[PDB]
């Protein structure tokens, strides 16, 4: 249970302090600065409803359908919005900032577990707290991340099934931190008895942070890659081990950076001079501004100590077991990507093709890479293309060459990072057998911009499968419930129209298909790719439409609109071709293939793969796993674009919720029988609606209910009767509420009126009496007056003292 | 609706008395129209009486008998609470389910909810019906209900 | 109607100032003039019609039983007043009885009021209906 306990300071709130409203007049209205607004209806003129806004007291006219139902105070800061009488855009947005401003950040909403970024550390993640969440159901304690994780663990042991926790959300919404916490908590409740294994699940973070993280306008330690971390357990439920999986790493970063943005921390640590002994091993000069692959955006970070973090990164590797030879191979390869960016070329000898302008850097590169600057540059200028039984020497200019370089850098980095991840797994892997696991996912959630490119599609298309994964689940849980209550009906899975958008993209005729195909061809371009797209899919697919225009002030170019469950998204295919396939000297690779440096060697060995083709493959892998597990969903949300705590930007939050999964989770769920009470509660709440119908003696609760509804002239559609509880279409309980208050009030008054009748009626008897009373009093006083004022009386009455 | 010339004889009876208590003159202050009906056995709601001509203050409108009838026959077609209507009503303040309720709550229900009752009026009907809160301070409303319903003079 | 009907005979002794077992249309004004103010002669003729038997002592009685007719007792009145005093204090408040007489029943007019309270017994706000009652019934004094 719970009371005043300190640990529950930022979890629960004073239910009594929240304890210190007309359904017909109170409601939500759209406000441009606050999303919605509280309002009291004034009049109506059809669709023309006019109201008053509590905050400024003004007036505005709003289309009836525009108006959204408001919840009674009875539902303030409700822990799980799945119970709120009115479940919508506004009633949700409200219940969210309300809690968040009171310090609350974990709010339930069905299967979801919405977590609003604090932007300040909180006393919620303490050991003692950890202990009161151990083994407790969710309705048995305040909404908390720990419960999603715990209820996950005790679900694994109890049911003997793999578990999957899916954290999602925009950038900077705090999903990495959530994931770490999830992991910590799992390690803190299933410990085993270099360093401890879990110590390494923990130290893997640094090195990965150094290569997958970077400072971005949104967040300061942004994971720029998707991650699927699995944690394995033994038969006694303790951690057997782990392993990792990455997804879409931001290769782009390696050579470009926007204003107020750095490259992966590693590059800056590398040039921190925190470990002087290595500067020579790497050939680096401890001033980052000097290098052209990182001197673009900013170089420092307010909360990042490019020097400390580097020393720690170093130890992390030592604690991970990487040999010094390995750790340094990494270091060398990384440093060499700084020289590649400081490798310049000349173009106009007398002939008009390119040629190197110095070797000094090219050499430093070839040194750290283990090659021949001669062979290197020779190949970087006049490559050896190959086709059939002939290998030609193609010439390329500045552009083609400088772009080749950058491609080599990107390619190298990706290859490297992937190796590192595989490496780390080798560590974190165990040679003991594992019974079951629980995997934590964490990839950027759906997001739409003014300009959505190939990247955005890749991400949205992903969450697309992901979201479809949820709907499926909901669909399953709904059925088992209906079947449970002998009331199962008109169904079909929720992952339905989610499938078409999906096929339009991953299936054979699909979009990504046209992109991967058009990439084997030489002189193909936007227009050729664009052509083929419209060709196969235009005016033939409802999900694929031509650009309609702007739904927001700074939006930009677009070629096609994709109908995602989150809404139609304008994607511009400009660049996709160059982006999908990674041009790199098939030659340079041959040279680095034969490098003498052991790591560079692994990095470029020969096979027997385009971005789009790689991802859909490793995504197929993922989903096949996720579907063989038991879901849990954690929706991360950013309050504002100021890292300011408490500040809540409505448009921003409303937005997220849309592509978040919540509002759809509400919708797919709305088509069933959302609001559902159990006959007991129904009786003690709605008997007031049909007193004169309840035979009198404590009858069975479904009969009381079977009657209240029957007598209420309840339309069979609006509801359906379980065996344990009664289900209702959405917002019906709403009507049953208003209808409940009108009556209750009227009943009271009818009683107050019966009482007033009792009184008066009682005084009647006295009024009947008092009449004759005053009737006497009045009349006599009148006789006496005429007497006294009689000419014969004063005369007479004077005629006698004698 | 239509009235028994007998049920009309009862009304003149009462209408007269009331005409008298603000001076005999064949008229009755509208602000008594409710009260006159009550003396007949009708249990109007304020909203009901203000709706047929009743007024808020003493001395705004005055009604010959001629108009009382139409007004009276109107109050008859109104809602009169039943035992159950009241029971379930009160039952909604009773958490436990034993049939008790903080006399305070009760005082609250009547003076704060619906069309509020004047404390002088509540204080008045606790004595008349003779409601008595147990040691802890709670009342058994089922009794308080049938009392009011019973009337000043039982059987 | 018992012992003072003999006193109406004693109050026949001054009726009969000039002793003729009767009183002319001016015999009356003579007795009146001998002590206070003097009645009209047209207050002597215009009333020629109230004597079903001219006038003596046994006609002074019977030409007055037209005014003392329609009265209620001393206990009947001191009970009508008792209908507005549930606390048995033998006293109505002043503003109360006044309101009672002026605005309910057969509403007294500005005058009848002015005249009824002119000599009404009222001490510190309370109107004594008991004592007041006597005044109205000759058990006290007007
Ligand atoms: N659950 C949380 N609890 C406390 N702070 C959080 C939480 N989630 C996000 N934050 C905020 O996120 C930011 C962390 O940014 P970042 O530099 O990327 O992380 P780190 O400190 O691990 O390097 C901080 O400003 C912090 O207040
Ligand atoms: Ca009157
Ligand atoms: Mg004479």
Report chain A's terminal Cα–Cα distance, integer Å: 102
SS3 A344: coil
Distance A767 CA to ligand 3 centre (A): 55
**Residue A662 is encoded by which pair of tokens?**
């919540």
Q: Residue A254: how many CB atoms within 10 A of its CB?
A: 25
Residue A457, token pair as written in the block: 């599609």
Give the separation between CA B67 and CA B32, rounded to whole angstroms: 13
In terms of Cα–Cα distance, which of A75, A151, A73, A158 is closest to A113?
A151
In a domain, C142, yes or no: no
State the Cα–Cα distance between residues A454 and A580, nearest whole angstrom: 8
Would you say A500 and A543 are in contact if contact means Cβ atoms under 8 Å apart?
yes
A43 neighbors A50 (Cβ within 8 angstroms): yes
Final residue before a domain boundary, out of C16, C41, C69? C69
Enumerate the β-bridge partners of residue A69. A27
Do residues A398 and A354 lie in contact, with contact meaning Cβ atoms separated by under 8 Å? yes
How far, in whole angstroms, is CA A737 from its chain's centroid?
A: 32
- Give me the count of residues in chain C: 142
Is C111 among the annotated ligand-binding positions? no
A52-61: which pairs have CB atoms within 8 A and are 24 or more residues apart?
A: A53/A29, A60/A29
CA atoms within 13 A on the CB side of A123: 10
Distances (CA, A) of B41 to A259, B21, B56, B76: 85, 20, 22, 9
The structure tokens listed for A190 are 């299933």
Same domain for C51 and C12? yes
C-chain CB neighbours of B21 within 8 Å are 104-105
**C-alpha distances in angstroms, A732 versus A110, A362, A670, A708, A715?**
19, 73, 12, 14, 11
Dihedral angle at the C-alpha atoms of A280, A286, A291, A297, nearest 10 degrees? 150
Q: How many CA atoms lie within 13 A of B91 on its CB side?
A: 16
| φ, ψ (nearest 5 deg) of residue A149 | -70, -45
Instruction: Give the whole-angstrom CA distance, residue C40 versus residue C49.
Output: 16
Three state DSSP letters for chain B: CCCCCCCCHHHHHHHHHHHHCCCCCCCCEHHHHHHHHHCCCCCCCHHHHHCCCCCCCCCCCECCHHHHHHHHHHHHCCCCCCHHHHHHHHHCCCCCCCCEEEHHHHHHHHHHCCCCCCHHHHHHHHHHHCCCCCCCCEEEHHHHHHHHHHCCCCC
Instruction: Identify whether the C-beta of residue A330 lies closer than 8 Å to the C-beta of residue A416.
Output: yes
d(CA B6, CA A78): 60
- Single out the residue in C18, C38, C69 at which a domain terminates: C69
- Structure-block tokens of residue A30: 């759209």
Q: Mind giving me the DSSP string for A630-651?
A: B--EEEEE---TT--SS---HH
Q: Which residue puts its alpha carbon closest to atom 9 of ligand 1?
A: A174
Domain boundary among C51, C69, C87: C69
* Experimental technique: X-ray
- Report yes or no: A319 and A194 within 8 Å, Cβ to Cβ: yes
* A108 neighbors A143 (Cβ within 8 angstroms): yes
Which residues fall within 8 angstroms of residue A460, CB to CB, at 6 or more apart? A446, A447, A448, A452, A562, A564, A566, A569
Long-range CB pairs of A19-25, under 8 A, 24+ apart, other chains included: A21/A72, A21/A73, A23/A70, A23/A72, A23/A734, A23/A737, A23/A738, A23/A741, A24/A738
Task: Name the phi and psi angles at A232, rounded to 5.
Answer: -105, 150
Return the closest-CA partner of residue A341 out of A253, A392, A443, A409: A409
- Tell me which residue of A766, C47, A189 sits closest to C39, measured CA to CA: C47
Number of domains in chain C: 2
Tell the residue number behind the tokens 């578990």, with chain if given. Answer: A163
Q: Looking at the structure, tell me whether residues C83 and C63 fall in a common domain.
A: no
CATH number of B3-80: 1.10.238.10
Of A248, A229, A233, A108, give the one whose Cα is nearest residue A164: A229
Which structure tokens are listed for A318?
């030592």
**Residue (of A716, A584, A599, A728) closest to A670 by Cα position:** A728
Q: Up-side HSE of residue A106: CA atoms within 13 Å toward CB?
A: 21
Same domain, C45 and C78: no
Closest CA to A774 of B26, B14, C93, B20: B20
- Which helix (DSSP H) or strand (DSSP E) does residue A667 occupy? helix A662-670
Nearest to A557 by CA among A547, A543, A545: A547
C125 domain-assigned: yes
Residue pair B14/B53 in contact (Cβ under 8 Å)? The answer is no
User: At what angle are helices A732-788 and B83-91 packed, to 10 degrees?
Assistant: 120
C62 shares a domain with C2: yes
What is the nearest CA distance from B54 to chain C, expressed in angstroms?
A: 20
CB atoms near residue A400 (< 10 Å) = 15
Q: Are B121 and A754 in contact (CB under 8 A)?
A: no
Q: What is the resolution of this structure in A?
A: 3.1
Co-location of C3 and C36 in the same domain: yes
Going from the Cα of A221 to the center of ligand 1, the distance in angstroms, rounded, reads 8
Query: C18 a known binding residue?
Result: yes
Count CB atoms within 10 A of the CB of residue A252: 12
Q: Is residue C53 domain-shared with residue C74, that is, in the same domain?
A: no
CA dihedral A738, A740, A745, A751 (to 10 degrees): 160
Q: Which residues are paired to A228 by β-bridges?
A: A441
| A233 Rama sector, left if φ>0, alpha if ψ -120 to 50, beta otherwise | beta
As a whole number of angstroms, the distance between CA A462 and CA A623 comes to 10
- Whether C129 is covered by a domain: the verdict is yes
Compute the CA torsion angle A761, A762, A767, A769 (nearest 10 deg). 130
Q: Under a CB-based contact definition with an 8 Å cutoff, are residues B85 and B121 in contact? A: no
C-alpha gyration radius of chain B = 18
Q: Are A30 and A39 in contact (CB under 8 A)?
A: no
Comparing CA positions, the residue from A579, A582, A601 lying closest to residue A590 is: A601
Q: Which residue from A247, A351, A272, A234 is spatially nearest to A617, judged by alpha carbons?
A: A247
Helix, strand, or coil here: A161?
A: coil
Contact assignment for C103 to B23 by CB distance below 8 Å: yes
The domain that holds C129 is classified in CATH as 1.10.238.10
What single-letter DSSP state applies at residue A330?
H
Do residues B28 and B62 touch, judged by C-beta distance below 8 A?
yes
Mutation choice for C interface testing from A773, A789, A790 by most C CBs within 10 A:
A773
Task: Calculate the CA A180 to chain-centre distance.
Answer: 16
CA of C12 relative to ligand 3 center, distance in Å: 13
Residue A440 bridge partners (DSSP): A165, A229
Q: Give me A513's structure tokens.
A: 């298909």
Of A35, A76, A117, A97, which is closest to residue A634 (Cα–Cα)?
A117
What is the phi/psi pair of residue A156, to 5°? Answer: -65, -50
**Backbone conformation region of residue C4, classed left if phi is above 0, alpha if psi is from -120 to 50, else beta:** alpha
CB A257 near ligand 1, within 6 Å: no
> Are the CB atoms for A717 and A52 separated by under 8 Å?
no
Nearest CA in chain A to C28: A795
| Residue A223, strand partner residues | A213
> Cβ C80–A786 below 8 Å, yes or no?
no
User: Which residue range is the domain that position C103 belongs to?
Assistant: 70-137
Chain mean position to CA A435: 31
Write out the residues surrounding ion ligand 3, Cβ under 5 A: C 18, 20, 24, 27
Residue A72 near residue A85, CB atoms below 8 Å: yes
Distance (Å) from the alpha carbon of C102 to chain B's nearest alpha carbon:
8
Q: Cα torsion at C108, C113, C115, C119 (round to 10°)? A: 130
Question: Which residues, at least 6 apart from B27, have a Cβ–Cβ distance to it below 8 Å?
Answer: B19, B62, B63, B64
Q: CB–CB of A286/A273 below 8 Å?
A: yes
Residues paired with residue A676 on neighbouring β-strands, in sequence order: A727
Which residues is chain A interrupted after (C–N above 2.5 Å)? 20, 193, 608
Supply angle C-alpha A767, A773, A774, rounded to 5.
90
φ, ψ of residue A452 to 5 degrees: the values are -105, 120
Measured between alpha carbons, how far is A520 from A756 in angstroms, rounded to an integer?
92
- Determine contact, residues A745/B114, Cβ cutoff 8 Å: yes
Separation CA A630–CA A640 (nearest Å)? 32
Q: In a 10 Å sphere around its CB, with 0-12 CB exposed, 13-18 middle and 19+ buried, how is residue A236 labelled? A: exposed
- The 3-class secondary structure across A23-68, one letter per residue, is CCCEEEEEECCCEEEEEEEEEECCCEEEEECCCCCCCEEEEHHHCE
Residue pair A147/A115 in contact by the 8 Å Cβ criterion: no
Question: Would you call A268 helix, strand, or coil by DSSP?
Answer: helix
C106 is in an annotated binding site: no
- Least CB-CB distance to A781: which of C7, C28, C136? C136
| Helix boundaries (H) for A485-610 | 497-506, 511-517, 526-537, 576-580, 586-593, 598-603
Please tell me the distance from the alpha carbon of residue A639 to that of residue A607, in angstroms, as a whole number: 47
Q: Would B3-80 and B81-152 be classified into the same CATH topology?
A: yes
Beta bridge partners of C126: C93, C123
Residue A216 CB–ligand 1 contact under 6 Å: no
Distance CA C122, CA C91 (A): 10
Has residue C52 been placed in a domain?
yes
Q: Which residues pair with A40 in a beta bridge?
A: A26, A52
Give CA–CA dist A678/A687, Å, rounded.
Answer: 14
Decide if C50 is inside a domain. yes
- A755 contacts in B (CB within 8 Å)? 110, 117, 121, 125, 148
Distance in Å, CA C14 to ligand 3 centroid: 12
CB atoms within 10 A of CB A479: 15
Please report, for chain B, the start and end positions of each structural domain, with discontinuous segments joined by +.
3-80, 81-152
Angle, alpha carbons A372-A378-A384 (nearest 5°)? 115
Q: Where are the alpha helices (DSSP H) in C47-93?
A: 74-80
How many whole angstroms separate alpha carbon C71 and alpha carbon C52? 22
Token reading at A572: 């511009």
* Euclidean distance between CA atoms A740 and A726, whole angstroms: 17
Angle between helical axes of A145-159 and A175-187 (0-180°, round to 10): 50
**Burial class for B121, CB neighbours closer than 10 Å (0-12, 13-18, 19+):** middle
Q: Do residue B82 and residue A692 have CB atoms under 8 angstroms apart?
A: yes
Give the residue from chain C lying closest to A790, CA to CA. Answer: C67
Kindly report the backbone phi and psi dihedral angles of residue A241, in degrees, each rounded to the nearest multiple of 5, phi listed first.
175, -165
Closest Cα partner for B114 from A474, A703, A754? Answer: A754
Q: How far is CA C129 from CA A772, C82, C94, C140, in A?
A: 16, 8, 10, 12
Beta strands in A120-248 (DSSP E): 163-168, 213-214, 222-223, 226-233, 239-243, 246-247
Q: Give the count of alpha carbons within 13 A of A89, CB side only.
A: 20
| Residue C86 falls inside a structural domain | yes
Tokens (6 digits) for A483:
């079947």
Inside any domain, residue C97? yes
* Annotated binding-site residue? C16: yes
Phi, psi dihedral angles at C138 (to 5 degrees)? 70, 10
CB A83 within 8 A of CB A65: no
Backbone angles phi, psi at A207, to 5 degrees: -55, -40
Q: CB neighbours (10 Å) of residue A227?
A: 21
Sign of torsion, CA C76 C78 C82 C87? negative
- Residues found in chain B: 155
Just give the CATH number of B81-152.
1.10.238.10
CA distance A232 to B5: 92
- Residue showing tokens 């006293």: C91
Give chain A's contact residues with C (Cβ, < 8 Å): 769-788, 790-800, 802
Angle between the B141-150 and B83-91 helix axes, to the nearest 10 degrees? Answer: 150
Of A300, A294, A309, nearest in space to A339 by CA: A294
Closest CA to A218 of A610, A643, A744, A521: A643
Q: At how many degrees (to 10) do helices B30-38 and B65-76 cross?
A: 50
Closest to B32 in 3D by CA, of B70, B68, B79: B68
Helix (H) / strand (E) containing A492: none
Beta-carbon contacts of residue A164 (< 8 Å; ≥ 6 apart): A438, A439, A440, A441, A625, A626, A629, A630, A631, A632
End-to-end Cα spacing for chain B:
29
Distance, in Å, from the CA atom of C78 to the CA atom of C73, rounded to the nearest integer, reads 9
For this structure, is A219 an active site residue?
A: yes
């Amino acid at each position: 249970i719970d009371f005043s306990d300190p640990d529950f300071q930022y979890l629960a709130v004073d239910r009594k302090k929240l304890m210190k409203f007309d359904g017909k007049k109170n409601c939500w209205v759209p406000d441009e600065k606050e999303g919605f607004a509280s309002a009291e209806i004034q009049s109506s003129k059809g669709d023309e409803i006019t109201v008053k806004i509590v905050a400024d007291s003004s007036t505005r006219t709003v289309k009836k359908d525009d108006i959204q139902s408001m919840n009674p105070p009875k539902f303030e800061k409700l822990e799980d919005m799945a119970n709120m009488t009115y479940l919508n855009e506004a009633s949700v947005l409200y219940n969210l900032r309300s809690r968040y401003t009171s310090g609350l950040i974990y709010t339930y909403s069905g299967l979801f577990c919405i977590a609003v970024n604090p932007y300040r550390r909180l006393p919620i993640y303490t050991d003692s707290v950890i202990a009161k969440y151990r083994g407790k159901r969710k309705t048995e304690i305040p909404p908390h991340l720990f419960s999603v994780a715990d209820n996950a663990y005790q679900n694994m042991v109890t049911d003997r099934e793999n578990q999957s926790c899916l954290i999602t959300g925009e950038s900077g919404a705090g999903k990495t931190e959530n994931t770490k916490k999830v992991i910590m908590y799992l390690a803190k409740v299933a410990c085993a008895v270099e360093g401890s294994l879990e110590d390494q699940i923990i130290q893997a973070n640094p090195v990965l942070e150094a290569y997958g993280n970077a400072k971005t306008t949104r967040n300061n330690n942004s994971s720029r890659f998707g991650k699927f971390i699995r944690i394995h357990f033994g038969p006694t439920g303790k951690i057997a081990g782990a392993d990792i999986e990455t997804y879409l790493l931001e290769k782009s970063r390696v050579t470009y950076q926007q204003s107020a943005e750095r490259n992966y921390h590693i590059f800056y640590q590398i040039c921190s001079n925190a470990i002087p002994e290595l500067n020579d091993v790497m050939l680096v000069t401890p001033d980052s501004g000097l290098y052209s692959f990182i001197n673009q955006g900013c170089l420092t970070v307010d909360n990042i100590d490019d020097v400390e973090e580097f020393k720690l990164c170093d130890e992390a590797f030592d604690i991970l077991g990487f040999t010094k030879e390995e750790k340094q191979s990494m270091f060398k390869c990384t440093a060499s990507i700084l020289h590649m960016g400081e490798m310049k070329f000349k173009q106009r000898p007398r002939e008009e093709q390119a040629e190197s302008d110095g070797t000094a850097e090219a050499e430093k590169v070839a040194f750290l890479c283990g090659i021949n600057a001669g062979d290197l540059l020779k190949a970087l200028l006049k490559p050896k293309v190959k086709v059939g039984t002939e290998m030609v020497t193609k010439g390329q200019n500045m552009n083609q060459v400088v772009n080749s370089v950058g491609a080599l850098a990107k390619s190298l980095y990706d290859r490297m990072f992937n190796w590192l991840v595989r490496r780390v797994n080798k560590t974190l892997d165990t040679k003991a057998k594992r019974n079951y696991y629980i995997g934590v996912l964490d990839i950027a959630g759906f997001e739409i911009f003014d300009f959505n490119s190939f990247e955005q599609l890749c991400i949205n298309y992903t969450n697309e499968r992901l979201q479809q994964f949820f709907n499926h689940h909901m669909f399953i849980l709904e059925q088992e419930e209906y079947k449970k209550e002998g009331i199962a009906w008109e169904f079909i899975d929720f992952g339905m129209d989610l499938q078409m958008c999906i096929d339009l993209i991953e299936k054979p005729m699909g979009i990504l298909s046209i992109l991967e195909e058009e990439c084997m061809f030489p002189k193909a371009d936007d227009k050729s790719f664009q052509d083929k797209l419209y060709q196969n899919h235009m005016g033939k697919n409802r999900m694929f439409t031509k650009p309609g225009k702007p739904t927001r002030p700074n939006q930009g170019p677009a070629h096609f609109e994709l109908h995602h469950y989150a809404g139609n998204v304008p994607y511009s295919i400009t660049g996709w071709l160059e982006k999908n396939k990674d041009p790199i000297n098939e030659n340079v690779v041959a040279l680095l293939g034969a490098s003498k440096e052991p790591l560079v060697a692994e990095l470029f060995k020969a096979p027997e793969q385009t971005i789009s083709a790689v991802h859909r493959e490793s995504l197929n892998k993922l989903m096949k796993n996720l579907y063989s597990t038991h879901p849990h969903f954690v929706r991360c949300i950013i309050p504002n674009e100021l890292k300011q705590p408490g500040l809540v930007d409505a448009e921003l939050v409303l937005h997220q919720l849309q592509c978040n999964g919540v509002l759809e989770g509400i919708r797919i769920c709305r088509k069933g029988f959302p609001s559902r009470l159990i006959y007991s509660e129904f009786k003690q709440r709605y008997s007031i609606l049909a007193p004169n119908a309840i035979p009198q003696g404590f009858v069975d609760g479904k009969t009381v209910s079977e009657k209240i509804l029957a007598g209420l002239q309840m339309d069979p559609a609006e509801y359906r009767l379980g065996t344990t509880k009664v289900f209702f279409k959405a917002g019906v309980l709403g009507n049953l509420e208003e209808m409940r208050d009108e009556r209750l009030s009227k009943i009271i008054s009818m009683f107050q009126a019966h009482i007033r009748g009792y009184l008066i009626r009682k005084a009647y008897k006295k009024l009947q009496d008092q009449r004759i009373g005053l009737s006497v009093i009045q009349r006599n006083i009148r006789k006496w007056l005429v007497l006294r004022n009689w000419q014969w009386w004063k005369l007479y009455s004077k005629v006698k003292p004698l | 609706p239509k009235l028994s010339q007998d049920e009309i004889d009862d009304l003149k009876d009462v209408f007269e008395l009331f005409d008298f208590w603000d001076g005999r003159d064949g008229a009755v202050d509208a602000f008594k129209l409710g009260d006159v009906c009550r003396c007949l056995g009708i249990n109007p709601r304020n909203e009901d009486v203000f709706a047929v001509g009743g007024t808020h203050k003493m001395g705004e409108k005055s009604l010959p008998f001629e108009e009382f009838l139409p007004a009276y026959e109107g109050l008859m077609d109104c809602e009169q609470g039943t035992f159950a209507d009241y029971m379930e009503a009160f039952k909604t303040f009773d958490r436990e389910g034993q049939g008790f309720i903080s006399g305070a709550e009760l005082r609250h229900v009547l003076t704060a909810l619906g069309e509020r009752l004047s404390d002088e009026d509540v204080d008045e009907i606790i004595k008349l019906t003779d409601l008595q809160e147990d040691l802890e301070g709670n009342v058994k409303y089922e009794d308080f209900v049938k009392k009011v319903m019973a009337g000043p003079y039982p059987d | 109607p018992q012992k003072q009907i003999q006193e109406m005979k004693e109050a026949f002794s001054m009726i009969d100032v000039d002793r003729d077992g009767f009183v002319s249309k001016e015999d009356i004004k003579a007795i009146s003039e001998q002590l206070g103010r003097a009645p009209d002669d047209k207050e002597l003729t215009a009333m020629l019609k109230e004597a079903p038997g001219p006038l003596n002592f046994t006609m002074f009685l019977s030409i007055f039983s037209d005014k003392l007719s329609g009265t209620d007792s001393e206990e009947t009145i001191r009970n009508a007043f008792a209908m507005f005093d549930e606390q048995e204090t033998k006293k109505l408040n002043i503003e109360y009885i006044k309101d009672l007489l002026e605005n309910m029943g057969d509403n007294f007019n500005k005058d009848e009021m002015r005249m009824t309270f002119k000599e009404a017994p009222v001490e510190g706000g309370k109107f004594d209906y008991v004592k007041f009652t006597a005044m109205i019934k000759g058990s006290g004094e007007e």
